[PDB]
Amino acid sequence: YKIITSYMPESFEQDAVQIALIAVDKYRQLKDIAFYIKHEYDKKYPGSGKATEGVYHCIVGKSFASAVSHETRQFIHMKVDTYHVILWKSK
Amino acid sequence: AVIKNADMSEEMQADAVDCATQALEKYNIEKDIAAYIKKEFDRKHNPTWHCIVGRNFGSYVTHETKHFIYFYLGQVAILLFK
């Protein structure tokens, strides 16, 4: 269990880390842990159906890469349990 | 270039599937390749997109309005959405 980068609220980041640790302990594949993370992280984030548009990102794998101007202070990309996992808000 | 599945603006998708050769010949690393491809796609198509290129990474998340495909090029793939 380790994190590599996160621009986010500390309590939200720790909550995401706990949920990711639970999912990684539970789920198996890339799609399976991706789906569990994408679903279960949408609870503790209050989904505002207002004019703002945001989403979840799922990357649970060995080695890909990206570098984008994502949502400001709303993206956590960790690398835990020999699996990098990126999750960002949709710009 | 190749593909796995597709539900997208196939005009923009099949335009990008041959325009990405410019960044593949241009850049020299998968991070920089994805950067130089997505910058060209954002200048070309619109100011809203999302692309994750490379391999050895999985994704199951909700898509955007009118773009969702896993379009590859010689096992160095792209996951494209708007």
Coordinates of C-alpha atoms in Angstrom, one line a residue:
Chain A
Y1 CA 0.0 0.0 0.0
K2 CA 1.7 3.1 -1.2
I3 CA 0.9 6.4 -2.9
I4 CA 2.9 8.3 -5.6
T5 CA 1.0 11.4 -6.3
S6 CA -2.2 13.1 -5.1
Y7 CA -3.5 16.6 -5.4
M8 CA -6.7 16.4 -3.3
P9 CA -8.2 16.9 0.2
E10 CA -6.3 15.0 2.9
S11 CA -9.4 13.3 4.3
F12 CA -10.8 12.6 0.9
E13 CA -7.3 11.2 -0.1
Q14 CA -7.2 9.0 3.1
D15 CA -10.8 7.8 2.4
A16 CA -9.8 6.9 -1.2
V17 CA -6.7 5.1 0.1
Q18 CA -8.8 3.1 2.6
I19 CA -11.4 2.2 -0.1
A20 CA -8.6 1.3 -2.5
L21 CA -6.9 -0.8 0.1
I22 CA -10.2 -2.6 0.7
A23 CA -10.8 -3.1 -3.0
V24 CA -7.3 -4.3 -3.7
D25 CA -7.5 -6.7 -0.8
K26 CA -10.9 -7.9 -2.2
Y27 CA -11.0 -7.6 -6.0
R28 CA -8.7 -9.5 -8.4
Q29 CA -8.3 -8.3 -12.0
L30 CA -7.7 -4.9 -13.6
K31 CA -11.4 -4.5 -14.7
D32 CA -12.7 -6.0 -11.4
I33 CA -10.7 -3.7 -9.1
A34 CA -11.3 -0.8 -11.5
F35 CA -15.0 -1.3 -11.3
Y36 CA -15.0 -1.7 -7.5
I37 CA -13.0 1.5 -7.1
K38 CA -15.1 3.4 -9.6
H39 CA -18.4 2.4 -8.0
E40 CA -17.5 2.6 -4.3
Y41 CA -15.6 5.9 -4.5
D42 CA -18.8 7.6 -5.7
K43 CA -20.4 7.3 -2.3
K44 CA -18.2 9.4 -0.1
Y45 CA -18.0 12.0 -2.8
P46 CA -21.3 13.9 -2.9
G47 CA -22.3 13.8 -6.6
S48 CA -23.5 17.2 -7.5
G49 CA -26.0 17.0 -10.4
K50 CA -25.5 20.7 -10.9
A51 CA -23.9 22.4 -14.0
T52 CA -20.5 21.1 -13.0
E53 CA -19.5 17.9 -14.8
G54 CA -17.2 15.4 -13.1
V55 CA -16.4 11.7 -13.3
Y56 CA -14.2 8.9 -12.0
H57 CA -11.0 7.6 -13.7
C58 CA -9.8 4.0 -13.5
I59 CA -6.2 2.9 -14.1
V60 CA -5.2 -0.3 -12.2
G61 CA -2.3 -1.9 -14.1
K62 CA 1.4 -2.5 -14.4
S63 CA 2.9 0.4 -16.4
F64 CA 1.1 2.9 -18.6
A65 CA 1.6 6.7 -18.4
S66 CA -0.1 10.0 -18.9
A67 CA 0.4 13.7 -18.1
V68 CA -2.6 16.0 -18.4
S69 CA -3.9 19.3 -17.0
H70 CA -6.7 17.5 -15.0
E71 CA -9.1 19.0 -12.5
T72 CA -7.4 21.4 -10.1
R73 CA -6.5 19.6 -6.8
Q74 CA -8.8 16.7 -7.7
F75 CA -6.6 13.8 -8.9
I76 CA -4.9 11.0 -7.0
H77 CA -2.7 8.5 -8.8
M78 CA -1.0 6.0 -6.6
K79 CA 1.1 2.9 -7.1
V80 CA 0.3 0.2 -4.6
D81 CA 0.5 -3.6 -4.2
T82 CA 2.5 -3.8 -7.5
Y83 CA -0.3 -2.1 -9.3
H84 CA -0.4 1.6 -10.3
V85 CA -3.9 3.0 -9.9
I86 CA -4.8 6.5 -11.2
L87 CA -8.1 8.1 -10.4
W88 CA -8.9 11.7 -11.5
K89 CA -11.9 13.9 -12.1
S90 CA -13.1 14.4 -15.6
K91 CA -12.1 17.8 -17.1
Chain B
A1 CA -3.4 1.3 -36.0
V2 CA -6.0 -1.1 -34.5
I3 CA -8.9 -1.2 -32.2
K4 CA -10.6 -3.4 -29.5
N5 CA -14.1 -1.9 -29.3
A6 CA -15.7 1.4 -30.4
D7 CA -18.7 3.6 -29.7
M8 CA -17.4 7.1 -30.7
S9 CA -17.4 9.9 -33.2
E10 CA -15.9 7.5 -35.8
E11 CA -15.0 10.4 -38.0
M12 CA -12.8 11.9 -35.2
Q13 CA -11.7 8.4 -34.1
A14 CA -10.5 7.2 -37.5
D15 CA -9.0 10.6 -38.2
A16 CA -7.0 10.4 -34.9
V17 CA -6.1 6.7 -35.6
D18 CA -4.0 7.9 -38.5
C19 CA -3.0 11.4 -37.2
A20 CA -1.3 9.8 -34.1
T21 CA 1.5 8.7 -36.4
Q22 CA 2.7 12.3 -36.4
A23 CA 3.2 12.1 -32.6
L24 CA 4.6 8.5 -32.7
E25 CA 7.2 9.7 -35.2
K26 CA 7.5 12.9 -33.3
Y27 CA 7.8 11.8 -29.7
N28 CA 10.1 9.1 -28.3
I29 CA 8.5 7.8 -25.0
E30 CA 5.0 6.6 -24.1
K31 CA 4.4 9.5 -21.8
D32 CA 5.6 12.0 -24.4
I33 CA 3.9 10.1 -27.2
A34 CA 0.5 10.3 -25.4
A35 CA 1.2 14.0 -24.7
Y36 CA 2.1 14.9 -28.3
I37 CA -0.9 12.9 -29.6
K38 CA -3.5 14.4 -27.2
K39 CA -2.2 18.0 -27.8
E40 CA -2.7 17.5 -31.5
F41 CA -6.1 16.0 -30.9
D42 CA -7.2 18.8 -28.6
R43 CA -6.0 21.5 -31.1
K44 CA -7.8 19.6 -33.9
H45 CA -11.1 18.3 -32.6
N46 CA -12.2 20.3 -29.6
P47 CA -11.2 21.6 -26.1
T48 CA -12.7 18.6 -24.4
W49 CA -11.2 15.0 -24.6
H50 CA -9.5 12.3 -22.5
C51 CA -7.0 9.8 -23.9
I52 CA -4.8 7.3 -22.0
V53 CA -2.3 5.6 -24.3
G54 CA 0.1 2.7 -23.8
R55 CA -0.4 -0.8 -22.5
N56 CA -0.6 -2.8 -19.2
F57 CA -3.4 -0.7 -17.7
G58 CA -7.1 -1.4 -17.3
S59 CA -10.2 0.9 -17.1
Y60 CA -13.9 0.5 -16.3
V61 CA -15.4 3.9 -15.9
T62 CA -18.3 5.9 -17.4
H63 CA -17.6 7.5 -20.7
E64 CA -18.2 11.0 -22.1
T65 CA -21.1 12.1 -24.4
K66 CA -20.1 10.8 -27.8
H67 CA -16.7 9.0 -27.7
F68 CA -15.6 5.6 -26.2
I69 CA -13.1 3.3 -27.9
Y70 CA -10.0 1.2 -27.1
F71 CA -8.1 1.8 -30.4
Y72 CA -4.6 0.4 -30.6
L73 CA -1.6 0.6 -32.8
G74 CA 0.7 -2.5 -32.8
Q75 CA 0.1 -3.4 -29.1
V76 CA 0.7 0.1 -27.9
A77 CA -2.9 0.9 -27.4
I78 CA -5.1 4.0 -26.8
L79 CA -8.1 4.4 -24.6
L80 CA -10.1 7.3 -26.1
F81 CA -13.1 9.2 -24.8
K82 CA -14.3 12.8 -25.0

